[PDB]
Amino acid sequence: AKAKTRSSRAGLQFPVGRVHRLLRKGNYAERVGAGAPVYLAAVLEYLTAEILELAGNAARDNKKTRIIPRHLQLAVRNDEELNKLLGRVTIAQGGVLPNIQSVLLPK
Amino acid sequence: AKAKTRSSRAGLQFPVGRVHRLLRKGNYAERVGAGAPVYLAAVLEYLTAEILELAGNAARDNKKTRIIPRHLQLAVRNDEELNKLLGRVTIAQGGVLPNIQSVLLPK
Amino acid sequence: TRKESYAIYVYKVLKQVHPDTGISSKAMSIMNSFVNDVFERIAGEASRLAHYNKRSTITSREIQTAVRLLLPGELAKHAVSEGTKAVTKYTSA
Amino acid sequence: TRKESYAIYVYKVLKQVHPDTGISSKAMSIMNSFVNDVFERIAGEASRLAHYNKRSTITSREIQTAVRLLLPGELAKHAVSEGTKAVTKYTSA
Amino acid sequence: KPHRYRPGTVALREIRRYQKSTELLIRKLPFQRLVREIAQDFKTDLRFQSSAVMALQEASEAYLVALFEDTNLCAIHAKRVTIMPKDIQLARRIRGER
Amino acid sequence: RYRPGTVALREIRRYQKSTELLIRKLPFQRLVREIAQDFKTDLRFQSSAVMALQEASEAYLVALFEDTNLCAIHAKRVTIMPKDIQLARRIRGER
Amino acid sequence: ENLKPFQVGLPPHDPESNKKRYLLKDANGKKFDLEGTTKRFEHLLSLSGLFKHFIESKAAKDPKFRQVLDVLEENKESIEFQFRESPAYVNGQLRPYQIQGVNWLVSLHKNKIAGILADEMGLGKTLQTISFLGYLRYIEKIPGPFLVIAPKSTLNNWLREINRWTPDVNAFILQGDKEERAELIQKKLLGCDFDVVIASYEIIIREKSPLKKINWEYIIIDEAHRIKNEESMLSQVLREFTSRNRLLITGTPLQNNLHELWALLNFLLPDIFSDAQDFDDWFSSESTEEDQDKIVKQLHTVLQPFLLRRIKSDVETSLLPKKELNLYVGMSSMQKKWYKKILEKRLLNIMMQLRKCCNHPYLFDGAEPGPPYTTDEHLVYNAAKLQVLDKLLKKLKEEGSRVLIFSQMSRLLDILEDYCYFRNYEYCRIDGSTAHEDRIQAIDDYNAPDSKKFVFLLTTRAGGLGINLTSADVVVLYDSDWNPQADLQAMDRAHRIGQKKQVKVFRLVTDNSVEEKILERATQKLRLDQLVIQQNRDDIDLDELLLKSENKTKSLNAKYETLGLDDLQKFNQDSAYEWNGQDFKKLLNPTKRERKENYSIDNY
Amino acid sequence: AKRHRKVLRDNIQGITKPAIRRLARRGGVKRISGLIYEETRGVLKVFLENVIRDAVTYTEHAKRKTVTAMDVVYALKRQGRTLYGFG
Amino acid sequence: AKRHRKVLRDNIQGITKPAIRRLARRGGVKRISGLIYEETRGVLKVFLENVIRDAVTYTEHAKRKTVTAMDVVYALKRQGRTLYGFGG
DNA sequence: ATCGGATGTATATATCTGACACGTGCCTGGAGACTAGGGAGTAATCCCCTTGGCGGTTAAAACGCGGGGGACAGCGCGTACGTGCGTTTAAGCGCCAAGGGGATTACTCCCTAGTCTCCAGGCACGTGTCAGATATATACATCCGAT
DNA sequence: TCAGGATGTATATATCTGACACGTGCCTGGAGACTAGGGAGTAATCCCCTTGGCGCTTAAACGCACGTACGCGCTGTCCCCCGCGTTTTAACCGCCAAGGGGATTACTCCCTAGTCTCCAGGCACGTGTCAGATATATACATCCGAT
Ligand SMILES: Nc1ncnc2c1ncn2[C@@H]1O[C@H](COP(=O)(O)OP(=O)(O)O)[C@@H](O)[C@H]1O
Ligand SMILES: [Mg+2]
């Protein structure tokens, strides 16, 4: 019969075959279920979509049409949930979030 | 023939068959060599002996002949080495080593 | 050669969300590293979770528990909902 | 109901460093937990080392690297020295 | 006039007496009540062991003692002797919890 | 000419807006080789390795200076000092 | 005043002489006496031969008792001082049954065994005990020592009686903060300036180390069912006490089990009932035959040797008997919906929750209508028991019988207080909250000779025993209890000696619910007690409801009358989760969390 | 009138002022302000919330209803503060 | 008289005063003392020492003699400061 | 307050180089049997945890007071930072030469692991005990706050 | 400063108990075959890194000099927090009742994974464009600082 990929018949965009292969050949457990790759692919797709939407918002805010590591940095640090999730990473070439302490400003 | 334990052959005290079983059953990797359990048992034996020697010294200094969690904490925290190894570790019923900031002391 | 990337899948998701923007190579690499990092975090948590319960199988239940252990709050809620949706669609279809 | 533990072995080690001191049960549980924790750390680092270099097996080289990578300096020196002497004795005998 | 210690000496004695013991300083039943009240967090009616609550109290007290040490350092840094909520907030911000 | 602090706020605005590297390239790269000579003789590096090292160092020092500034403000000051940075590092579980 | 000739022959009181016997000098003088055990077993077999069941098993265990058995095998006036009048050395009179109790005590004394005094309440138990100790003093010439462990409430009463009917005896009670307690220790206890010590359950645990260091002639215990558990800390501690014999003054033993009675026996004579399984399998629960009532029932012969109780039903007479009026009540709509809600759901112990719903749904938080909260008939309007209670309270009030409500939850007492205030009756509440002085003043207020106290709330298992409310006429056990004698003592708070007029005691029951199961099991245990021990001494139109419940009670009495021992111990433990058909069975997130704005360069 | 509770002051108030002072002395402070006794309750409540959330997650996954010492230990280890002893 | 290498400068001083000032500004400070420079050089040297030691350990385990960006990334992640962008 | 002035800030233009589209093949994911063992379900046992209530001891906790010493504002004041200007100096970028280091890429085998089959010998568990760590008391010697 | 108190700090003693030694059952670690595939060795091939240099542009870094404003020390002055005595109340044991929850220890069985064999499309790699984003000037507007 004609073969249809698990990504398509699950409705996702991330690969499910590759995720299943990594889960097997990654020494995570002896046996890997059949819904685990689907669930993991869905979660990864969701997180990617969320962060990319915020980054695109920032890039449009700065009158540009290409997301750059600066926009990734800026979106991540401005969203508090993503900031907690990525609290320890350092996006290379991201700069820093603009902030001056109130006391330092002139009278 | 006559069984001769791998711990005896290596000259250690900690079990090597048990360590081999743990390496095999923990799915750390597909195959475990024949010298890895011996090396690991030797390292664990060394660290145990070190911490126990320090704890026993502390117990004698406290005029006691039995190690207690307080003595373990004193042994760990006094030397700059096991303190760095056990940095994030909290020891139940350990207390804290004594110090008082010199500013708070009287004139 | 033959190094797997996730670049094409991330680009598909981007052209779904913002169908007029693009990604530079550095941002693309950062996104790929992000996906790999999250994958290994979730998989490692699920592996330890199965080991704690004397199970020899990773299944969607362990994946879900690891998701709600790692992602904070609203992120966890939405990710769980989406994963369950995808799994039910897959099994039904 | 059989529960494996390291109490017997750490007590054997104790009775040759300080041959007259004892050890309370709570201290014994703390020591067993410490041994398990250090074993997990070294084994996990060796597993990740094997995965990094495409190798499929764990051996004394990985264990030595993990020790030299986790233990701080002057402690790791003695640890690796004693591990090597033990493994050479095992190989010779 | 009855004998009265000048301010600071009883505090120093208390410091050097509590830095030598090892027992718990929060009361067992109040801490357990607090824990079970919070436990309506991501579930509803639940059962706790006793080792669970003891472990939880150990962890909490160790955390609070470390926080108070950092706070003391901040207060001394400000050329002061009293600890203040500004010191708590500074210490707990720098560690990375806020 | 300009009142004190004006150029300071101007420079803060300038540098919190951009993203480039702040330490020179060759001095840092030379320092990395020199400090790496001790652990093992005749190592080779590569540009990506040294760039990753520099990026990490930049991020670390920037966060350290943020903590130091916040410490100095805590003590009713605007000038940062070695006592400030030592307090920051020691609170942050490093000293 | 004139009984001092009996005091002749006693040595003069002197701590130095007392220290010879009181302090047991032998540090590890504890040993198994073969002579005493042989005498015990010989007399025990002389009374009857059934006792070999324990002995042969124990011989199968440690054989240095098996050789004692062999010794007893190979080798094979003690006049009771009947005291036809009151004993001279006690100033006062003793009734004939009291005399018989005293003689039983003496006869057990001169047999190297003991016996649980378990007389009915009010029959001067402490008088029996003081008389017997005086027997040892004046006649047997053993002034002391003697330990008189008792409940804290009655310590003053024990001392008052001991100084009243036998003033010669010197005795004191330990009490007070630890400093004066230790002062009393060092001055008299180790000083040996007494004959009878009085303590409390708590003090025995507290001041045990000094009390170890006296050879105790006996160790008396007041109401003893406290010791019915042998794993209780008090039981554990009160076993290292080196002692000759023991006494266990109590009320009714065997309150909710048989193993309980075994342990209670095991206290007095450990060398006989040394094996749990022996008693647990010889004539305890088994599954063999019609033996249940053919033989093992008849095998009371093991007890009658050492146990006693004198039925106050006929040895006194005045308390007209009792009047039990169980009322089966049906659930109301709020109860229906709530009870189903628990059945298919902080809610643990579903069985406890079901009891709450059978009492008043307002116990559940957020059940009553409101806020704002009122107190009108919407209170009675949702609790069936409370509706019947309102009707019955009105009927009693028009008759004029002031009532005691013995609830089982103090929160239920709160709702009852609100209801009573809304109905303009007044009360006095006593529970696990009111301090002592509150309790005494409340009792006095209720028992004022002209007291305007209609209702008087309590909790069933509270107030100890000195609470005396014979002025009351009706007791409403709003809830039934697991232990039948718990409610028995509760409902004898009004039936106690001195009560003049016949009393009625209601027991509201929620039909077709848990309460029926609880009542069934409680009746199981009560009938068990009777067999084992007592033999071998909108509106509901209240009238038709009364008749229906009375018929139901007769039917269940018929059901449980004809059960057998092994059958009656069954404890069917029928699951109450299923009541009318039960199966043990108990989003899209469109939030799109947030989207910030102003990601441009406008901070400055 | 009184069936309503009107009782049980907040459980966070059970962490009394002197207990906070004892923790403070073991930390090594000599002089304490007056708002520390509220800041401390806030921080303790936050910490407990996090740890208990993770422990309950583990317990629910194992299909139990009992939070065990090992569940708490795993939660703390995940949070990054290992606890030797218990389990 | 100059055959030797008398001419040389220390490498930690290559972290110039204004570079530390630029870092300080990006951190958001307004006035810098005179000893912040030396303290900063010290802390940077310590940090680099730790990271480089771990990276070199990885490389010498793999039987190589070049320290690759992946090895540095592994070393940082082990230190607890994971870094996104240079692969991995 | 106004004017000067230095400094971002929008704005049109040209450059280019980095993102996006398109064809190839090759290898991995999918389809289809086959099978075994993992996990779900069931029954029996036993110990811990729940809920509501009771009674007691007794240290901590709450409260009030008084007084002192520490924090917080003002006041000089005299540095040590900033800002600006002129001048070297070094970073960065090109360029030259020759090698080794390393990562595929492709066989080739040895040897060293996993797998199976017994089988005894480690080790965990269930019993005693008795020696160490308690709590008590007492005498002492040792800081602290008022001359 | 010295005598007057309050507080650890030792010393001696009776008690409790929980480490420690000992005996059994069993299960798993070791001996002994057999096997097969992972990894070690070899040997091409191309790209990057090293070590000495050289020439050139051009911004940053350095050094120097006013010269403020700020960090620091003193003084004053509240007022807030500590020490201490006095009630009181809540923790902490001990209890009681029933039942459920969780662990073990078997058993049973079914179904869902792993293991193969084929076989095609999906994805990576190598190309070829073109447009998004610089940098450059330019006029605009917009705080800042001295009269
Ligand atoms: N002359 C008497 N003869 C017999 N009993 C008496 C006499 N006088 C008083 N008593 C009763 O003897 C009782 C002994 O105490 P008792 O009621 O048995 O308390 P408990 O039941 O707690 O032992 C007293 O309650 C007292 O009423
Ligand atoms: Mg009595």
mmCIF file of C-alpha atoms and ligand atoms in Angstrom, chain G residues 93 95 98 122 124-127 165 222-223, ligand 1:
data_model
loop_
_atom_site.group_PDB
_atom_site.id
_atom_site.type_symbol
_atom_site.label_atom_id
_atom_site.label_comp_id
_atom_site.label_asym_id
_atom_site.label_seq_id
_atom_site.Cartn_x
_atom_site.Cartn_y
_atom_site.Cartn_z
ATOM 1 C CA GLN G 93 -20.314 -0.424 107.677
ATOM 2 C CA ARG G 95 -22.933 -4.323 102.869
ATOM 3 C CA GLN G 98 -19.141 -5.869 99.745
ATOM 4 C CA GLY G 122 -21.421 2.841 92.398
ATOM 5 C CA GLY G 124 -18.047 1.050 96.398
ATOM 6 C CA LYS G 125 -15.143 -0.592 94.594
ATOM 7 C CA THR G 126 -12.545 1.515 96.374
ATOM 8 C CA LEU G 127 -14.178 0.475 99.627
ATOM 9 C CA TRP G 165 -12.432 4.830 106.561
ATOM 10 C CA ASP G 222 -8.358 1.890 89.116
ATOM 11 C CA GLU G 223 -10.576 1.644 86.005
HETATM 12 N N1 LIG L 1 -21.287 3.284 103.729
HETATM 13 C C1 LIG L 1 -20.967 2.996 102.447
HETATM 14 N N2 LIG L 1 -20.994 1.729 101.989
HETATM 15 C C2 LIG L 1 -20.680 1.439 100.715
HETATM 16 N N3 LIG L 1 -20.318 2.353 99.798
HETATM 17 C C3 LIG L 1 -20.250 3.662 100.125
HETATM 18 C C4 LIG L 1 -20.574 4.063 101.502
HETATM 19 N N4 LIG L 1 -20.427 5.398 101.557
HETATM 20 C C5 LIG L 1 -20.038 5.814 100.326
HETATM 21 N N5 LIG L 1 -19.916 4.778 99.481
HETATM 22 C C6 LIG L 1 -19.542 4.869 98.053
HETATM 23 O O1 LIG L 1 -18.393 4.107 97.694
HETATM 24 C C7 LIG L 1 -17.987 4.660 96.443
HETATM 25 C C8 LIG L 1 -16.560 4.313 96.067
HETATM 26 O O2 LIG L 1 -16.261 5.051 94.889
HETATM 27 P P1 LIG L 1 -16.932 4.632 93.493
HETATM 28 O O3 LIG L 1 -18.259 5.337 93.389
HETATM 29 O O4 LIG L 1 -16.882 3.130 93.382
HETATM 30 O O5 LIG L 1 -15.926 5.277 92.418
HETATM 31 P P2 LIG L 1 -15.279 4.390 91.247
HETATM 32 O O6 LIG L 1 -16.472 3.767 90.571
HETATM 33 O O7 LIG L 1 -14.534 5.393 90.403
HETATM 34 O O8 LIG L 1 -14.384 3.417 91.967
HETATM 35 C C9 LIG L 1 -18.188 6.157 96.565
HETATM 36 O O9 LIG L 1 -18.661 6.666 95.318
HETATM 37 C C10 LIG L 1 -19.242 6.302 97.641
HETATM 38 O O10 LIG L 1 -20.414 6.912 97.102
#
